[PDB]
Amino acid sequence: DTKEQRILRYVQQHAKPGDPQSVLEAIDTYCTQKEWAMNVGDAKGQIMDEVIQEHNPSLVLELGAYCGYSAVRMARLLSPGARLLTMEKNPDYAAITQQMLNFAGLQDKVTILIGASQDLIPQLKKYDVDTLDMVFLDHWKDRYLPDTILLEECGLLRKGTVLLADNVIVPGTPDFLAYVRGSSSFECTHYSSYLEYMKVVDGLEKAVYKGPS
């Protein structure tokens, strides 16, 4: 059985149905235990929460999902009428994410889109998306830059749209950080989470779009 299947089984066995906090804790506990991800709730979850609270988005796009942790984390904060779109190419991960949201009682806040972002971002207009208020870029860091370009080119960003990208500790290729920092179209903030230690545990980049030039 896959890691993601085992994460779901553990939630099913230990978390309280319809309780997002219990789901998040159960995922966090099991992953920290297995040394798969260290205290995601403190390293990335709190930054996710504060960005969402700071900008109060009505429409969020999540690019990338694995076991549904991030989708639950975000959907649990959205106000009535606010919605999360979660786009993921791998149907197994999308299926776990769906079941995790069902278990948490958050399925009515989320639309899961299964497919490649190159195919689906240009079709977001068909989901009644004019522009996005926030984008969370997760897991597949080599997609961050090309996905950002596609969002720009499809007119899905407006002045004030917030991009938040996870796991940007080291430069990679394609280099998302160099693009958003270099461009005068994005105002950027870097977050480094150390937890109680001296070494970075997770790094995130917030890039706020200044509007089309």
Contact residues for Na ion (CB under 5 A)?
Answer: 181, 183, 186
| Residue 44 annotated among the catalytic residues of the structure | no
Tell me which of Na ion, Cl ion, none is bound by residue 186, counting a contact when its beta carbon lies within the kind-specific cut-off of 5 to 8 angstroms: Na ion
Long-range CB contacts for residues 177-182, cutoff 8 Å, separation at least 24: 177/205, 179/145, 179/148, 180/148, 180/205, 180/207
Judged by CB under 5 A, the residue of 30, 37, 66, 164 near Cl ion is 66
Q: Choose one: 70-78, 117-125, 127-135, 170-178; the region binding Cl ion (CB under 5 A).
A: 70-78
| Beta-carbon-side half-sphere exposure of residue 132 (alpha carbons within 13 Å) | 28
Alpha-carbon distance of 174 to 178, in angstroms, equals: 9
Tell me which of Na ion, Cl ion, none is bound by residue 6, counting a contact when its beta carbon lies within the kind-specific cut-off of 5 to 8 angstroms: none
Q: Which helix (H) or strand (E) holds 189?
A: strand 186-193
Tokens 């299964």 map to which residue? 114
What is the separation of C-alpha 105 from the centre of its chain, rounded to a whole number of angstroms? 18
Judged by CB under 5 A, the residue of 2, 9, 17, 50 near Cl ion is 50
Given the residues 138, 147, 202, 205, select the one marked as catalytic.
138
| Residue 141 annotated among the catalytic residues of the structure | yes
Q: Is there binding between residue 92 and Cl ion (CB under 5 A)?
A: no
Task: Tell me the closest approach of the beta carbon of residue 154 to Cl ion, in angstroms.
Answer: 24
Tell me which of Na ion, Cl ion, none is bound by residue 136, counting a contact when its beta carbon lies within the kind-specific cut-off of 5 to 8 angstroms: none
Of 93 and 176, CB closest to Na ion:
176
Question: DSSP string covering 100-111, please?
Answer: HHHHHT-GGGEE
Given the residues 44, 62, 167, 202, select the one marked as catalytic.
167
| Residue 196 annotated among the catalytic residues of the structure | yes
- Tell me how many degrees the CA angle 104-115-11 measures, rounded to the nearest 5: 20
Residues near Cl ion, by CB under 5 A: 50, 53-54, 65-66, 69-70
